[PDB]
Amino acid sequence: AIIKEFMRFKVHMEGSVNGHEFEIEGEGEGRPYEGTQTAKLKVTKGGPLPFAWDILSPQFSKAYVKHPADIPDYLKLSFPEGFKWERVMNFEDGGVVTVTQDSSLQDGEFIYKVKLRGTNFPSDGPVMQKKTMGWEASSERMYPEDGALKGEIKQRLKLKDGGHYDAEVKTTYKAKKPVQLPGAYNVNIKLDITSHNEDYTIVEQYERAEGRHSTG
C-alpha cells in the first residue's frame, strides 16, 4: 500500500550543463525489494543535448535498492512523504555537477523531481565531446552523519577510446521526517544504457542496486 513489490515512477529533470538549459521527462518501473529498475527518458526541451548522456544517467532512484533484512532501509522507510537528496560530483578534468532531488509517493507511484547544474566541463573533454561509453559498476559507501545518510562513490566512466574518466561523488540523503538511520554499509550498483536513439533524445536505462554489510 505504501511500497509494492512492483512500483512505477515518474521523473522530471530541469538542468543546465555549461549553460545549456534542458528538460527531461521519464517514466520507469522496477522491483524495489529486488533492487532492479528500468526507465525510459525523453528530452523535452534543449534537445538534442551537446553533452554526454552519461553525466545525467545516475540522477534518474534509491527506493529500488535491495537491502538485507537486518539493515533498516532508510529511504523506503521515509515514504509516503519521502526524502530529498543532494549530490556533488567532481570530475577529474574540472567538470562539476551538483544535483538536488525530491522523492515522494503519490497515488501509488514514485514521483521524482531533479534539478541539475553542470559547470566547468572542458570544451575538449569527453563530456562535451560525447566520448563516453557508460559507467563501470560502482560501490557506494554509506554511513550516517548529522541525522542524514551519506554516500560516497569513486565512479568511473568508460571512454569510447578505451580507458577511463573518474569522478568523486558524495551524496546526502535526508528523510522528510525523522527516520532511524542504519550503520555503515555498501551498495553495489550497475547502471546500463539498454537502448537509445541516434542523438539520445530517447534513452532507456537499467539499474541493479544491492546493499551489503561492509562489516561482520
Partner: nanobody, 124 residues
Framework: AQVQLVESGGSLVQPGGSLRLSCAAS????????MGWFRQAPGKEREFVAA????????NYADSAKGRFTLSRDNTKNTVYLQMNSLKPDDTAVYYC?????????????????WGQGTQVTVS
C-alpha cells in the same frame, strides 16, 4: 536479534465473538518495524491477514479481514493490536506476527525477516 516479537491474546471464543491480539516489538529496530499478521491453520498454508507500517500510518488488509478486523499501532510501545470481530470456526489458527525494516505491509512472507512464536486462536 535486532527485533524480537511477542504475540499475545490467543484464546477460545464463540462463533460471532471477538478477540484482540497484540504483538509487542522490542530491540534496536523495533521503532522501524512494519508488522504483519499471518495465520496458519492445522495442516494448511500460512496466509496473510493484515499489516501496518512502522509509523502506524498505513494499513493493508486481506479481503477476509476487511470490514471486520482492525489493525492499529501504539508507537510508544512499538506494539500492534489486531481487533478481530465476527469470528467463525474457520478463523481457528495459530496467528503469527512478523516484521520487516523496509516499510513492506503486504502478503509476501519472504519479505518479513523476523517472526514471533505465534498465539493460538480457537473459535467454537
Amino acid at each position: 536479534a535486532q527485533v524480537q516479537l511477542v504475540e499475545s491474546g490467543g484464546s477460545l471464543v464463540q462463533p460471532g465473538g471477538s478477540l484482540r491480539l497484540s504483538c509487542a516489538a522490542s530491540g534496536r529496530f523495533a521503532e522501524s518495524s512494519s508488522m504483519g499478521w499471518f495465520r496458519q491453520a492445522p495442516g494448511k498454508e500460512r496466509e496473510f491477514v493484515a499489516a501496518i507500517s512502522w509509523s502506524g500510518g498505513a494499513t493493508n488488509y486481506a479481503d477476509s479481514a476487511k470490514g471486520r478486523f482492525t489493525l492499529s499501532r501504539d508507537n510508544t510501545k512499538n506494539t500492534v493490536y489486531l481487533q478481530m470481530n465476527s469470528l467463525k470456526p474457520d478463523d481457528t489458527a495459530v496467528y503469527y506476527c512478523a516484521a520487516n525494516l523496509g516499510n513492506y505491509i503486504s502478503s509476501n512472507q519472504r519479505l518479513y525477516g523476523y517472526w514471533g512464536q505465534g498465539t493460538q486462536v480457537t473459535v467454537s
